[PDB]
Amino acid sequence: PSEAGHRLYVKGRHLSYQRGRRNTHPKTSLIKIEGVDDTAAANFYLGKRVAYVYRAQKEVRGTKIRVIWGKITRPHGNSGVVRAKFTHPLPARSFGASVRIMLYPSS
Amino acid sequence: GLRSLTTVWAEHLSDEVKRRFYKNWYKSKKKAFTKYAKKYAENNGASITRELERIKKYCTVVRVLAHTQIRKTPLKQKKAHLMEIQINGGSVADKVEFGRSLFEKPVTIDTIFEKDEMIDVIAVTKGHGFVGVTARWGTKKLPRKTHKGLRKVACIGAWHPSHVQWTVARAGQMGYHHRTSVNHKIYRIGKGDD
Amino acid sequence: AEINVEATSWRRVEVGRVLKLENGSLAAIVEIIDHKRVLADGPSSDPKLATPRGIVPLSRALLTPIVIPKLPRGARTGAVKKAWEAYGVDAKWKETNWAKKQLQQERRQSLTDFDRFKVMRLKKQRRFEERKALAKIKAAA
Amino acid sequence: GRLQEYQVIGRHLPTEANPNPALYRMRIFAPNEVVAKSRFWYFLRGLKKVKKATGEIVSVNVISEKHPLKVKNFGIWLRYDSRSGTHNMYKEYRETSRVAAVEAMYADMAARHRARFRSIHILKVVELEKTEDVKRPYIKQLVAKNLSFPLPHRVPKISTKKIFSAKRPSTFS
Amino acid sequence: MRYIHSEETIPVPENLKVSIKSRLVTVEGPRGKLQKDLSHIAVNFSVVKKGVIGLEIHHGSRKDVAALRTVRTIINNMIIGVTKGFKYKMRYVYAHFPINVNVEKNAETGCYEVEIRNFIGEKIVRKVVMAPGVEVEISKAQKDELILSGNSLEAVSQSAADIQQICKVRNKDIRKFLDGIYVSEKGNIVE
Amino acid sequence: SSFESVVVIDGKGHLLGRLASIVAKQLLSGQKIVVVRCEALNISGEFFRAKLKYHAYLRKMTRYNPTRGGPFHFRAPSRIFYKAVRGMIPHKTARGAAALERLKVFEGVPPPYDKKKKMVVPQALRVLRLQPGRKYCTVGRLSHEVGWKYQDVVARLEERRKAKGAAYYERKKLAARQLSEAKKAAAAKVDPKVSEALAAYGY
RNA sequence: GCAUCGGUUCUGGCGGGGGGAUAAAGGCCCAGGGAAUGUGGCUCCUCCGGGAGUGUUAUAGCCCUGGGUGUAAUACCCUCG
RNA sequence: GCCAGAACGCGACGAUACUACCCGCACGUUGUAGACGUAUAAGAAUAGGCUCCGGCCUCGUAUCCUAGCAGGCGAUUCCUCCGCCGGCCUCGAAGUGGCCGUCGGUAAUUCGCGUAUUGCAAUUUAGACACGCGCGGGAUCAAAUCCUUUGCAGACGACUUAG
Structure with a gap:
């Protein structure tokens, strides 16, 4: 009974920082959301919240998993990539990791 | 490339071959193929006949393992030598059947070779310790009035090549190399009992 | 002298051939400008199929099997409409496989969340009788 | 670029010796009326002794195609500058309006003869009324009786973001 | 300048059968069968009438249209060869040293082989093997003739050129030493 | 766009340089790629043009010692495709090095990777890019005339x-x-x- | 974390007004004049698809000039929300 | 053909004392370039193909699966789907899959009790690979180096031999 799954978020990837050709700015990042292609479709996800979860070694308050919170700021380019800003810049080793895109501030 | 997938041994092995698998044979227990021998006379050797059937099915070339009887020579050494010999024949089934029938049997050289046949010889040449350029490569000797030695090479390179190159003669080890000499002829095969 | 040739055969770009534009519109060719552009229009009562008069590039069009017979070259809008209704182009296109496939799509993009649950339960009810018949046939072999 | 035809009328500044001077009118192809006036002074400086400092513009208007939904043949007379010397040609085009032929001619000369916009003068454009006045052989074939042809080997259109298709495409559209 | 439509036609007599599939032509008639592959040329084949074959090219360039006439005559050669065959003749030309040949029979396979001896008094025996389907004969009509026959023009002609190219004089004035074997006539077996 | 665990690409009929550009972008994003039948790739232009290009490559070698530092010329069809990809990746950094472990290349279809679904990249297919009437060659043939030794073995296994x-x-x-x-x-x-x-x- | 405001800024949708040949075209209607890549007829040839000639709307239709429906609609430019 | 053989390239076989080996599950200090339905096997042509032989093809915008305390306890109903084991066949490119059988689970239809209080959001601590340990069952009783010696070897190590 109840063989279905449990998912209430959209998966994304952390691509790189915001950069020119030789200078990078760790303040903002670029994230590719799954299934979005044009910049018109990317308008739906403005203002939503995203999270980045990873495993640590030590246990602090009953868990070994930390979270970093952020939100989507504006579209980027013509290919549906978006910009995001987090409370702390991403660890810069997660170029290729996965992040979760919520749907909290709806409509 | 090529790779081997199976191999089978005979039931009984002489003490000559067993010496090859050890570096201190005198104080060992000589248990080389003790557990393997029990594969014979167990389910009528069911395990052995399975591997032979596999070679008839998946293989394309078959080789044979043979060794010498060094005990019949005036040599002081008692450790035999082992090698592989390829069988060139009609069919894969014929190769395995012929090879299996020769277990623990002797073969004489007159069955392999015959008179006035052109063969090749492979071995390792005589060794010399450590030699200079004059004897190793064969360069001209320097004049009699040379300071700091006269059995050398005067110039070993130009300037902006900037490194000693791999094509310049230099001192080192001579001899004890592997060589293959071809096209030798056989005059006579003599029998020992005669 | 029996001759059998198995070669492809396309559809010709002639006068009277009706195209299907990218945004679900129909137009009848009345004049050929180049090998890349044509002049076409379609007078249709249905606002979904109607198109104005103008030039359409041939790389954004598809050739439908319908062709209007004996359409005079360079005819005006009034004469084209007369032949458009007489041949019954609107009824002919409705029964083609291309039209049915598009219609079968449209019902799917407009489905309420409550309606998605409803179609899942109905599919399972029909699926139950399929496995009963499949097992019976497989056992019979 | 994207052009359209104008008419522009000029005049020498009136003086006490010569009141009521003559009036000159030209047809100029230009993207906008700001550069339409500039071309008028350029052509006029080569025919009469009038400048912009001693002249004035009387009127500028826009000429529009009378029947922009009819197919017709055009012929153009022109001169240009090569890398050594000047030459004259006469080419033909097939389309629906007068303005686009000048657009088509500008792109054609830039490719086949490497001639820029700076060095082309247009002498006269006339629409060929009949069918027996077509000269060049690449246009008689487009006016043949009962023209029809297929379109073999046309690539289907696939979204540029959908990588990794799941089956082999076909080219029999 | 790209040409909209270029077309050619090939008639077919009421004696043989022809079938085309995936640009692979098979021609079969009274004297045998031949095949040719034309997958490297973009042509559209069609059946114009009861006994006429049509082929055409759409939107082709000047260079592309050129190949249209090449294809037409090649297929016509196939039809002729299967109903009439081909026949070549050769002659010997020598000043002092006679030329001796020996056309030995099939060498355990379909190929024929021709041996040429005593060319300008040399001790080489030089051997050439013909392509399959080609039969070499020594003529009896008159002296110093070689007759080659077969079904396909490509095989008959290439084998004939092989014999001519092997008899060459080196380090001599070729305007004076006209020794060699040359081809002299081309035609069909029938008529 | 979609995120799969692994994707298998059938190499037959794909242009060498156009396919390698798509692959190099996917690897740096985080995707896993497997390329199969690398001996059936294609290169535009006549075969003789490709041979002259390869011969000029073979003439480069370190002068003072050919066993070190010199450009090592791999001769297998999968290794030719691998060389193209390595030039489009910053392979001298840790980030670039990690990307190369997400790629696998083979000749033929090894036993792990048959009984699988093989995808097709439509932006590098030859039949959709080249103009009819032009000439092309095959990477597999080019490897034969430079020292590849196992061409016929792969042909027999593929028939099985x-x-x-x-x-x-x-x-x-x-x-x-x-x-x-x-x-x-x-x-x-x-x-x-x-x-x-x-x-x-x-x- | 949410609701109500202030400063800066990016990006969607809707309602109006003006201009030009008071857009040009276009639909319907009235009057006049033409032609061919000649519709229907007629003649000849080909039955093998059809082709050739004559000739101005008939059993298809096209082009040019003037008027009404008109202060028609629409495109482009500017402007008030 | 011939010479070297990656000291971070690979395969076959022999004997393995010291828990070093094999089987079962018991937890978890500890590790990871990054599970959250990680679901899909014809070949071939592209100026031609597929098929259930009636037809079909621009389109993966497809197909399968998908309800219940993170998914309870019973009933009316129904012979579907899934899993651990066992036995026969099969698989060699870097060896995989099939059939049969026992056992355990199971909304296709329709019902009866239980959910609160985590207080208006805070990762939904849930997957599979290794590795360290703790038990209780099975099998097993080996070698290498130093040292003396040899000269087919040798600057010293190393190498060919003997004890």
């Missing part, structure tokens, strides 16, 4: 696995034939009203 798949097709064809008759027989008999309710929903 293609014969095995012919028998599998017969079983698959039978299963589809039986399923069609079951749906026709069941749907008529039983369901009174589920049919048209489903039809109005687009199913």
